[PDB]
């Protein structure tokens, strides 16, 4: 951990984004929603995550499903992309 950095400076918009897991999706989707309402409000990733991550473990396989179907496809999509890339 102890990264404190959302992304990087050296990165081309061409290369495929690393593989994401169902969990991540839950966190991301949650963020995008926060901006939709409070676009002009700060979001302490540190705290925001503490509430999200905890909500991921407390979730039931049924709920995670929504993020399971997506992630499951996020692994096959990226894999194929790498084939063409390198």
Curated annotation (Swiss-Prot):
Highest taxon above the source species: Eukaryota
Tissue specificity statement from the Swiss-Prot or TrEMBL entry: Expressed predominantly in placenta.
DNA-binding interval(s): 16-86
Modified residues (Cysteine sulfonic acid (-SO3H)): 30, 52
Location relative to the cell: Nucleus; Chromosome; Cytoplasm
Disulfide pairings: 30-52
Modified residues (N6-acetyllysine): 10, 37, 50
Signal peptide: none
Family affiliation: Belongs to the HMGB family.
Annotated function: Multifunctional protein with various roles in different cellular compartments. May act in a redox sensitive manner. Associates with chromatin and binds DNA with a preference for non-canonical DNA structures such as single-stranded DNA. Can bend DNA and enhance DNA flexibility by looping thus providing a mechanism to promote activities on various gene promoters. Proposed to be involved in the innate immune response to nucleic acids by acting as a cytoplasmic promiscuous immunogenic DNA/RNA sensor. Negatively regulates B-cell and myeloid cell differentiation.
Disease listed for this protein: Microphthalmia, syndromic, 13: A form of microphthalmia, a disorder of eye formation, ranging from small size of a single eye to complete bilateral absence of ocular tissues (anophthalmia). In many cases, microphthalmia/anophthalmia occurs in association with syndromes that include non-ocular abnormalities. MCOPS13 patients exhibit colobomatous microphthalmia with microcephaly, short stature, and psychomotor retardation.
Protein name: High mobility group protein B3
Organism of derivation: Homo sapiens (Human)
Full-protein interval shown: 1 to 79 of 200
């Amino acid at each position: 951990g102890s990264s404190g950095s959302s992304g990087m400076a050296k990165g081309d918009p061409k290369k495929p984004k690393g593989k994401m897991s169902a969990y991540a999706f839950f966190v991301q989707t949650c963020r995008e929603e926060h901006k939709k309402k409070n676009p002009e409000v700060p979001v302490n990733f540190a705290e925001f995550s503490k509430k999200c991550s905890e909500r991921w473990k407390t979730m039931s396989g049924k709920e995670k499903s929504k993020f399971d179907e997506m992630a499951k496809a996020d692994k096959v999509r990226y894999d194929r992309e790498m084939k063409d890339y390198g």
